[PDB]
UniProtKB/Swiss-Prot annotation:
Organism (species): Homo sapiens (Human)
Designated name of the protein: Cytoskeleton-associated protein 5
Region of the whole protein represented: 852 to 1080 of 2032
Protein family (similarity comment): Belongs to the TOG/XMAP215 family.
Subunit structure and binding partners: Interacts with TACC1. Interacts with SLAIN2 and SLAIN1. Interacts with HNRNPA2B1. Interacts with TACC3 independently of clathrin. Interacts with TACC3 and clathrin forming the TACC3/ch-TOG/clathrin complex located at spindle inter-microtubules bridges. Interacts with NDC80; indicative for an association with the NDC80 complex.
Tissue expression summary: Overexpressed in hepatomas and colonic tumors. Also expressed in skeletal muscle, brain, heart, placenta, lung, liver, kidney and pancreas. Expression is elevated in the brain; highly expressed in the Purkinje cell bodies of the cerebellum.
HEAT repeats by residue range: 4-42, 85-123, 162-200
Job description of the protein: Binds to the plus end of microtubules and regulates microtubule dynamics and microtubule organization. Acts as a processive microtubule polymerase. Promotes cytoplasmic microtubule nucleation and elongation. Plays a major role in organizing spindle poles. In spindle formation protects kinetochore microtubules from depolymerization by KIF2C and has an essential role in centrosomal microtubule assembly independently of KIF2C activity. Contributes to centrosome integrity.
Any coiled-coil regions, as ranges: none
Length: 229
């Protein structure tokens, strides 16, 4: 039933053990954390230095620790509930970066983690601020693919898009001319769903900050978008 504060269980001993140079020792720190949360069942939104600890292992050199960290982020979302919207900018956005991993199973696990958080937070906290746009901006074709494909999926479930959604459009426009075809394809797929919220006038105008050639063709398929909303 009740919610415990677990930040008293996130010892300085434990933090450093998560950041050890031996991966088997780092795994010990994550095992305890996983057990702390499971044994708690439901927790308060204050988790001490654990965000800082988990942020680091999202980029671990051993990919089964990235994976255990994602599973721990998933169980955190469930154990904490909507209060986890508090950790979106500092902890949740680093999950998005994991979408740039070259291994599909790692990318798949990132997406499943982000979705698990979205269930408790809803999409608004993710779209607010330049933070997401900053990620999409990155010239990683795995991260662009997955992120755009994520937005294609989530946007049609929104009736309160923040002003800050416009921030993604310059980078959305990059992706329509990305080197990678899969990226170009998911940028195309996200075109309608951006317009639905931003309107055609903001979209077309935003093509003005493009080179003549790009601005030219972007508007073309931007007009094919006016077929649907």
């Amino acid at each position: 039933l009740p919610r415990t504060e677990i930040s008293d269980k996130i010892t300085s001993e434990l933090v450093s053990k998560i950041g050890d140079k031996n991966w088997k020792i780092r795994k010990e720190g994550l095992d305890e954390v996983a057990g702390i949360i499971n044994d708690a069942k439901f927790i308060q939104p204050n988790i001490g230095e654990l965000p800082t600890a988990l942020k680091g292992r999202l980029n671990d050199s051993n990919k089964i620790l990235v994976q255990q960290t994602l599973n721990i982020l998933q169980q955190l979302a469930v154990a904490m509930g909507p209060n986890i919207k508090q950790h979106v900018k500092n902890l949740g956005i680093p999950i998005i970066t994991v979408l740039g991993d070259s291994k599909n199973n790692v990318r798949a696990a990132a997406l499943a983690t982000v979705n698990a958080w979205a269930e408790q937070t809803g999409m608004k906290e993710w779209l607010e601020g330049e933070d997401l746009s900053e990620e999409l901006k990155k010239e990683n074709p795995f991260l662009r693919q997955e992120l755009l494909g994520w937005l294609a999926e989530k946007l049609p479930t929104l009736r309160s898009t923040p002003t800050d959604l416009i921030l993604c459009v310059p980078h959305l426009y990059s992706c329509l001319e990305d080197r990678n075809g899969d990226v170009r394809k998911k940028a195309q797929d996200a075109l309608p769903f951006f317009m639905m919220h931003l309107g055609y006038e903001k979209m077309a105008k935003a093509t003005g900050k493009l080179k003549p050639t790009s601005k030219d063709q972007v508007l073309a398929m931007l007009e094919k978008a006016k077929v649907n909303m």
